[PDB]
Amino acid sequence: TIKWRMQTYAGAALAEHVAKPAIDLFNRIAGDRMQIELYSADQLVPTGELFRAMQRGTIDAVQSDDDSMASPTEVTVFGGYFPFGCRYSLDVPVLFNQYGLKEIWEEEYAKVGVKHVSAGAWDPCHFATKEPIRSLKDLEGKRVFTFPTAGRFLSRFGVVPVTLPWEDIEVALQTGELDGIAWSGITEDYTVGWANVTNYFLTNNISGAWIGHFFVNMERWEELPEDLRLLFEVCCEQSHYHRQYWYWGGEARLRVHGDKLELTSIPDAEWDQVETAAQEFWDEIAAQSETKAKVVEIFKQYNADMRKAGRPYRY
Amino acid sequence: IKWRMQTYAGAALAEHVAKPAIDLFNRIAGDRMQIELYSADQLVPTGELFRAMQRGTIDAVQSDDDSMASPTEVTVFGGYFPFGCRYSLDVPVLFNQYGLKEIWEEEYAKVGVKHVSAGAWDPCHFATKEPIRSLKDLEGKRVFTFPTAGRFLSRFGVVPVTLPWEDIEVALQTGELDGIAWSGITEDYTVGWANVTNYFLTNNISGAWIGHFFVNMERWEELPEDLRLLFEVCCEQSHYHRQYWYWGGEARLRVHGDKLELTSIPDAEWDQVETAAQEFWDEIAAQSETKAKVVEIFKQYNADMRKAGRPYRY
Ligand SMILES: [Cl-]
Ligand SMILES: [Cl-]
Ligand SMILES: [Cl-]
Ligand SMILES: [Cl-]
Numbered sequence A: 001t002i003k004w005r006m007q008t009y010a011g012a013a014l015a016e017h018v019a020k021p022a023i024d025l026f027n028r029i030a031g032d033r034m035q036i037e038l039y040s041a042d043q044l045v046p047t048g049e050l051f052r053a054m055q056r057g058t059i060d061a062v063q064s065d066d067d068s069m070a071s072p073t074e075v076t077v078f079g080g081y082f083p084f085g086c087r088y089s090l091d092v093p094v095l096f097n098q099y100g101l102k103e104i105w106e107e108e109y110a111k112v113g114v115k116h117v118s119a120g121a122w123d124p125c126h127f128a129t130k131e132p133i134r135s136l137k138d139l140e141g142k143r144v145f146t147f148p149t150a151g152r153f154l155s156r157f158g159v160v161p162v163t164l165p166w167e168d169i170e171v172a173l174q175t176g177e178l179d180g181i182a183w184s185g186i187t188e189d190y191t192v193g194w195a196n197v198t199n200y201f202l203t204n205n206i207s208g209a210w211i212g213h214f215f216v217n218m219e220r221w222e223e224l225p226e227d228l229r230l231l232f233e234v235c236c237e238q239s240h241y242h243r244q245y246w247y248w249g250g251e252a253r254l255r256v257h258g259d260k261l262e263l264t265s266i267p268d269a270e271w272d273q274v275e276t277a278a279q280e281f282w283d284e285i286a287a288q289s290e291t292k293a294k295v296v297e298i299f300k301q302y303n304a305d306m307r308k309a310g311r312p313y314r315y
Numbered sequence B: 001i002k003w004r005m006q007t008y009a010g011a012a013l014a015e016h017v018a019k020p021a022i023d024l025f026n027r028i029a030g031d032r033m034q035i036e037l038y039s040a041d042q043l044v045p046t047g048e049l050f051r052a053m054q055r056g057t058i059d060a061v062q063s064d065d066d067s068m069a070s071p072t073e074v075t076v077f078g079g080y081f082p083f084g085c086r087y088s089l090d091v092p093v094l095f096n097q098y099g100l101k102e103i104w105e106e107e108y109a110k111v112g113v114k115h116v117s118a119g120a121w122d123p124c125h126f127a128t129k130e131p132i133r134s135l136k137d138l139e140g141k142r143v144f145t146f147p148t149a150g151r152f153l154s155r156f157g158v159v160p161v162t163l164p165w166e167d168i169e170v171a172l173q174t175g176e177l178d179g180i181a182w183s184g185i186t187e188d189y190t191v192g193w194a195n196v197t198n199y200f201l202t203n204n205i206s207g208a209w210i211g212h213f214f215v216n217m218e219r220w221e222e223l224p225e226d227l228r229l230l231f232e233v234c235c236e237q238s239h240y241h242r243q244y245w246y247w248g249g250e251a252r253l254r255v256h257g258d259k260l261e262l263t264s265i266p267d268a269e270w271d272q273v274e275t276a277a278q279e280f281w282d283e284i285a286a287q288s289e290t291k292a293k294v295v296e297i298f299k300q301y302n303a304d305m306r307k308a309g310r311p312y313r314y
Helices: A012-018 A020-033 A047-056 A091-098 A101-110 A148-157 A166-175 A186-192 A218-223 A226-257 A268-286 A290-309 B011-017 B019-032 B046-055 B090-097 B100-110 B147-156 B165-173 B185-191 B217-222 B225-256 B267-285 B289-308
Strands: A002-008 A034-039 A061-064 A114-121 A126-129 A143-145 A180-184 A200-202 A211-217 A262-264 B002-007 B034-038 B060-063 B113-120 B125-128 B142-144 B159-161 B179-183 B199-201 B210-216 B261-263
Touching: A012 A020, A012 A186, A012 A226, A020 A034, A020 A226, A020 B225, A047 A061, A047 A114, A047 A211, A091 A101, A091 A114, A091 A290, A091 B225, A101 A114, A101 A290, A114 A218, A114 A226, A126 A186, A148 A268, A166 A180, A180 A186, A186 A226, A211 A218, A211 A226, A226 B019, A226 B090, A226 B225, A226 B289, A268 A290, A290 B225, B011 B019, B011 B185, B011 B225, B019 B034, B019 B225, B046 B060, B046 B113, B046 B210, B090 B100, B090 B113, B090 B289, B100 B113, B100 B289, B113 B217, B113 B225, B125 B185, B147 B159, B147 B179, B147 B267, B165 B179, B179 B185, B185 B225, B210 B217, B267 B289
Parallel strands: A002 A034, A002 A061, A143 A180, A200 A262, B002 B034, B002 B060, B142 B159, B142 B179, B199 B261
Antiparallel strands: A061 A211, A114 A211, A126 A180, A126 A200, B060 B210, B113 B210, B125 B179, B125 B199
C-alpha cells in the first residue's frame, strides 16, 4: 500500500551494516502494508541535493548526518564530527533524550518541512593514511576526506579537506588523489575495504562519536497510520542499538587484532594543542547564532559534568 | 494470542525497564496478540518464576538468571558477576560477538526455554544508612543483593539478605536492612530507595547487570514469524532505552542529586576486593567446563580492553 524510498549517506558496503538490517526487518514485519526501498550514497540524487529532494518529496526518507547534507538549519554544524563533543557513543542518545537536543532538532527541521525521527551515534573519527602520522606537523598539507565542519577545524593544522563521493574514495586512496581519510573509525575501515588501500591508523581521535539521524518528509510522516509510525520508530531505534554494540566491539577488537593498519600515536602533551584549539572553535560557532550558542553551552555543561561524575565517564 | 510476562522489576521500576516496550508491542500488534505485564512476585514468587515459565503458566519473563536460580551452568554469570563488565555496552558485545548468545541459547533450550536476548542494566553500588569509608565498614551490613554477588560479598562480612523487591523501601527506613547492593543511583532515586538511605559508595562491584528476555519454548515456536520479529525488535528497543537511561542517570544524579552523600574507599584498599574477585572467578571456573569456558571469555575480553586502550581503559 505505502511505498517509500530512503537514501542513506552510507556507501553500499557500509549500508549493509548501518541501515539495511533494520530496514529489512521493518519490511518483513510490515509486509503488504508498507515497504521501504533503501538506496545508498548518491544513488537517487547527489549529496548536494539530498535535503531538498526529501523536502520536496522526491525521496521519502533519509539517513544522514546534518553536516554533509548541508541542511538549512542552525544545528547543521553539530552533526557528523563536532570536534571533541562526545567522548562516548552513549553520550549521543543521552544528549538528545535528556539534555534537550531532540526538541531543538525537531523544531529546526520542522521549520523546513522535515520530521526529525531519531538521532544516534556511529563511530569515532580517526585518521587513516598512506604515510604515518606521529606529530602534528605530519598533518600539514595532507589531503584527507572528512566532514565539512570537522574539516574546517582541521584546516587550522594545515589539513586540506577534500570532498569526493563515498563510492570513489577507495580508488582515490589507491591512486594517491587522497593522502588519507578522517571520515570514520577502524570498524568501517576494515569493513568497507579502505584498510586495504591505506597503511596507518592514528589512535588520537577528534570525536568519540559521529551524530546522524533518520529523517522523513513531513507530509509523508503525517500520512502514516499510527501502528506503522511506531513500527518505523522502533526499527530505527533497533538500528541505533545495533550500531552502539557493532562499534563498541569493532573498534577495540580491530585495534588489538587487525593486521591491515599499523597504529601510530601523537604524544598527549602535543595533542593537547588540538583540544585547546577545539574549545576556541566551539566559541566561534557559538558566536554565530542564539541556537548555536545554546547547543554549544549544552555540550560544555555536559562535558564539565562528566568530569565531576568520575568513573567510568572520566578518569 | 494472549501472553503474560512477569518481570523481576518492582512496579515503580517496571515503568522504566519493561513497560514502554511492551506497550509499544501491544499498540503495533493490536488484535493479533497482546502481552499483559506483571511486576515483581505478582503472579508467582521469584523462587517459582523459572518453573512457572518452563511449565507454561507464564509465557515470558524479563529477569537475570541469578535471582530466579535458573537450573543452568550459566546462572552464576547473570545479575552482577563481580567485576565482569566495566561498561554497559560490554554486555551486548560479549553476547553478540564473543559467543555468549549461543551458549545461553543452548543452556536454556535444554530446559525448555528460549533465550530471546540479553542486555545490560545498571552498575552495582552500596546505598546505605551509615557511611562506608573503609572495608571494615562493610562488616555486619545486612543488604539486599543478588545470590552470586552476595556469596562473593559474604567473604567481607556482608550479610546478603533476600526479600521481595516491594518490601525493601520500608525495610530500609524501619528494621534491619542497613542498605542495598542491588542497583545503581538511577534506580535508587527513581524507586524511592534514596529517600530511606543516606550514603552512596562510589566503588562498584560490577559496571553492568546482565538480564534477559526469556520465553517458554513451546510458546516461542507457536509464534507467527512477523510477531516473533516484532517481539525481538521491541525487546532490543527496551535494551537500547536502558543503555541511555542508565548512562545518563548515573552521572547526572551523582553530580546533582541531593539525597545521598557520596563516599569512597581508597583505591589501594579496594584492591583487596578486586583480588578476591579474581579468586572467586577461578572457583567458579573449576566447577564445570561450561563455567570455565565463560570465565575465560570474560578474562580474555577484559585483557583485550587494556590492550585497546582509550576510551575502554585509561
Ligand atoms: Cl540497521
Ligand atoms: Cl533523538
Ligand atoms: Cl522498556
Ligand atoms: Cl543476546
